[PDB]
Symmetry: C2
Subunit: 309 residues, 2 copies
């Protein structure tokens, strides 16, 4: 057989494509996370956070999911909630784009808009109030600290990279949001496969908080246009111990690099995908990395309307 | 190994998911064509029409692709042209949505807008003029009659359905645009595997031209909102001989059914995906089809902004 009992179980097995106009002699290869149920790397963790919450008794028939997000992880949780029969509340500011509202209403989400002036703070409060209102009803899965998040990457994303390269991967380049990807991938290859690879974290030069921490310098975040990376703090799901190297990238370059992915490689991916590649391209063009296979996570699919396509 | 030398070669291997709120006892299973390079069933034929044109000498270094389309097949050709280093012209009316323009410019297409008043006729003329201007330069791959189109479905889409069901598929339900899908799938299972399945074509009740032809009645098309099916004529790539059954569906139902796919199954698919499912659900709820595995092509991914999400 090979028929998924629901859409959640179809996560991953995403492809590796070799880049032609990046790297040297084809040392740069990309893994298309756009090719997922809800079209992002995130529905891997959408799937396993719900599954883990089930297995350990925190999520049960009748019980409902609450989360203060509207990005790839909201969409991801939505599809699994729809797929598995959970009611879901996502809180976000009333200033969110009609687009994202429409997409999430479509997936059967109860949309609680919070005050726009309260920014993201205010959506987090409103989620948290709903949870205090009845703690036997609503569950917050908490992507930033939930081990289920990096656990899925250790069990699927990581092994898939091992498999499809035949143990030949030397370098892994992954933008950091929750840190879940890099953490899980790196644990799989270094610890379950026993290969001493170079794991490279990627962050906005505008918010170089991983770089600052490790240098022992004032953590100072700021705004950037690289959606889904550069949270402005070190997440619990970032395991600083498996990070070999930290590469910073600027918005403009992430943008331009995602543009190039389209017109020169024919790969529709997101801003963070560009960020990831510019970092890899830089590494790949250093002689110390000449004869080394570098693998890059492209987190999302390009189909948007705001800076780029 | 398993690293694609370019994005074109990553086509297919798309998943089968079982529906919970459709069919009976889970006799309805869906194959997610959203999970492709350019995010549609079409980049399967984007890939193989170019490959075939290469193998037989019609497409060569320097030579350029021209096509009067802007739907899934334009996007598909774009990604392969970008992936393989071909210049591409797509003609379409100047009335196309900024969205589709932006997406295609992004993939490195030369966009030739034709008069809006000339409708689709006028884009076809303008393509055809460019081809007459220099026949050693520009090539029209012609999805409606190109055998490479159904050939890819015989070689990939069909086998994948065979494999993942373990020879247990009984019914195949597929909306008709070019006919390429149904034709290729059905040839694979009936002729290469030797299983006497029921191939079901799906069309808008508003343009029931397959139904009319076979009844020997006046072919009379009309407008419908089911994007990518119901062309208003019988394509050469529709092999009427392998069609067992023709199911008509209305726009409203296709729409509503795609809405249900989202909120009840957590599957983001397109209008034509809804059309496909309502037809399958109807068949699946007939006792003659009770103990039969029905497989449905979901051609596209939902991420749009016009009627639905």
């Amino acid at each position: 057989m090979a028929i998924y009992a629901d859409n959640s179980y179809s996560i991953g097995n995403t492809p590796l494509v070799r880049l032609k106009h990046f790297g040297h002699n084809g040392n740069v290869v990309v893994k298309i996370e756009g090719r997922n149920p809800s079209y992002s790397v995130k529905c891997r963790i959408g799937a396993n956070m719900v599954w883990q919450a089930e297995k350990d008794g925190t999520l049960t028939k009748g019980k409902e999911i609450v989360d203060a997000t509207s990005g790839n992880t909201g969409i991801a949780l939505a599809y699994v909630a729809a797929a598995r029969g959970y009611k879901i509340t996502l809180t976000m500011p009333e200033t969110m784009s009609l687009e994202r509202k429409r997409l999430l209403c479509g997936l059967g989400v109860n949309l609680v808009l919070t005050e726009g002036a309260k920014g993201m703070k205010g959506a987090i409060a409103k989620a948290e109030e709903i949870v205090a209102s009845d703690p036997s009803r609503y569950v917050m899965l908490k992507q930033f600290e939930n081990p289920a998040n990096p656990q899925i990457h250790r069990e699927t994303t990581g092994p898939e990279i091992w498999k499809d390269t035949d143990g030949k991967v030397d370098v892994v380049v992954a933008g950091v949001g929750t840190g879940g990807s890099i953490t899980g991938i790196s644990r799989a290859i270094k610890l379950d496969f026993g290969k001493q690879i170079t794991s490279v974290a990627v962050e906005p030069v505008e918010s170089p908080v991983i770089s600052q921490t490790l240098a022992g310098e004032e953590v100072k975040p700021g705004p950037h246009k690289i959606q889904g990376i550069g949270a402005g703090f070190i997440p619990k799901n970032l395991d600083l111990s498996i990070i070999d190297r930290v590469e910073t990238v600027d918005s403009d370059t992430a943008l331009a690099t995602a543009r190039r992915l389209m017109a020169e490689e024919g790969i529709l991916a997101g801003i963070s995908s560009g960020a990831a590649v510019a970092a890899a391209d830089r590494l790949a063009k250093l002689p110390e990395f000449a004869d080394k296979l570098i693998v890059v996570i492209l987190p999302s699919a390009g189909e948007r309307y705001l800076s780029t396509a």
